[PDB]
């Protein structure tokens, strides 16, 4: 068994910095290059940098050149990434990975990734707006109530209904970033339509990083 354990993620203001670490266990660093890979939310992987543990030499991606610096320590058996002058453009999950020699070999084993976020709005709690059900005939006789969870930062926000009691028929979207620099997501509950006036339908949006939540009751509108 080989392990790569990431740490050091968090929230950074534009122009700030963050030092990330990745510990190795079950293997040495020497003879291998340690690499960092960036994954912006909603995107694929981007190379950041690599260091040959038995070299001390490094190489960097153009996308992070100058701004990011890497190193490795074979006594501690750990890899590091120093990210300076961070921008909103740098929001991503930061992964550590290993490969043999300086190059020509793919990254075999990866750590799990630590999220680092940057925005013009350092933080905001969510607010929630309703979505009315259709009052017209529908296929299957079903209908749904919903809401929009708006203007919060950072992501994740977990959404469930009726204080976690209603998971059945629950459909939520991942958040996307708005022009406000803040995130928003939609959600609904689909049930036989007569249930929309019987069951409780409260959007419960949970955001642990700011110790907050919004409990929003959604009910049919007359229309």
């Amino acid at each position: 068994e080989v392990q790569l354990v990431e740490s050091g993620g968090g929230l950074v203001q534009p122009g700030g910095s963050l030092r990330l670490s990745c510990a190795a266990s079950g293997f040495d660093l020497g003879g291998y290059s340690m690499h960092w890979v960036r994954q912006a939310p909603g995107k694929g992987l981007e190379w950041v940098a690599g260091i040959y543990a038995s070299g001390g030499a490094t190489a960097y991606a153009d996308s992070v050149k100058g701004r990011f610096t890497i190193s490795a320590d074979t006594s501690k058996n750990t890899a590091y990434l120093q990210m300076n002058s961070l921008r909103a453009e740098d929001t991503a999950v930061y992964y550590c990975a290993r490969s043999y020699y300086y190059g020509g070999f793919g990254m075999d084993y990866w750590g799990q990734g630590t999220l680092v976020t940057v925005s013009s709005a350092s933080t905001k709690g969510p607010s929630v707006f309703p979505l009315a059900p259709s009052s017209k005939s529908t296929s299957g006789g079903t209908a749904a109530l919903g809401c929009l969870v708006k203007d919060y930062f950072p992501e994740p926000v977990t959404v469930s209904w009726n204080s976690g009691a209603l998971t059945s028929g629950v459909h939520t979207f991942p958040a996307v970033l708005q022009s406000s620099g803040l995130y928003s997501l939609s959600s609904v509950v689909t049930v036989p339509s007569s249930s929309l006036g019987t069951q409780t339908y409260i959007c419960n949006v949970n955001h642990k990083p700011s110790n907050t939540k919004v409990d929003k009751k959604v009910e049919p509108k007359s229309c």
């Binding site: 890979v37 694929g44 992987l45 190059g103 009315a132």
Partner: protein, 214 residues
Amino acid sequence: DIQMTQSPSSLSASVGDRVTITCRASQSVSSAVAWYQQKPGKAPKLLIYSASDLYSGVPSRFSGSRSGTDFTLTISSLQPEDFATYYCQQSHTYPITFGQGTKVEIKRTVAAPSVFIFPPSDEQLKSGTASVVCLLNNFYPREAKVQWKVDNALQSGNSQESVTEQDSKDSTYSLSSTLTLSKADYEKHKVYACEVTHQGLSSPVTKSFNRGEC
């Protein structure tokens, strides 16, 4: 700066079926291409290195070959755990460049969404803005879009869309499209409509409202 072109953008194949994905480097990268699988909430895992060498811990189902300059990843027989977006990277020289990712879908029976529309309400309009919301629920396949109309004309440049994750059993998903208008723009038009279209819909679903209605 060698880029990775991939095709198809997505592939539909059922469990037990064969999947092929092609990665095309813009320049010579020798045989240093590597393939990855990633699950939501998890690290990427190496499947194949040095073009055709199987990585430890990876099932034999993942194999591949080169012909001329074209390299293909093959899943000999799909299992429920082999549905992921697969990525290529080139390790030959630096910088390492990654491709966009090819999504493999379960090829479930294709069908239309349950569609709902919510016209901007009087309460929502208190913000000084208007937002028209149209939702397509529990449908399949992954490819869908909404064409918006105003006064029966096509709209463009004033809409946004978001898409959710696929269901753990049926791989269905929902799509949500919106229009953004200032209250002042909302006031300039009378009829709004959501035209739903995708592979499983034989007749596009049109939902509509008059300004001020619900």
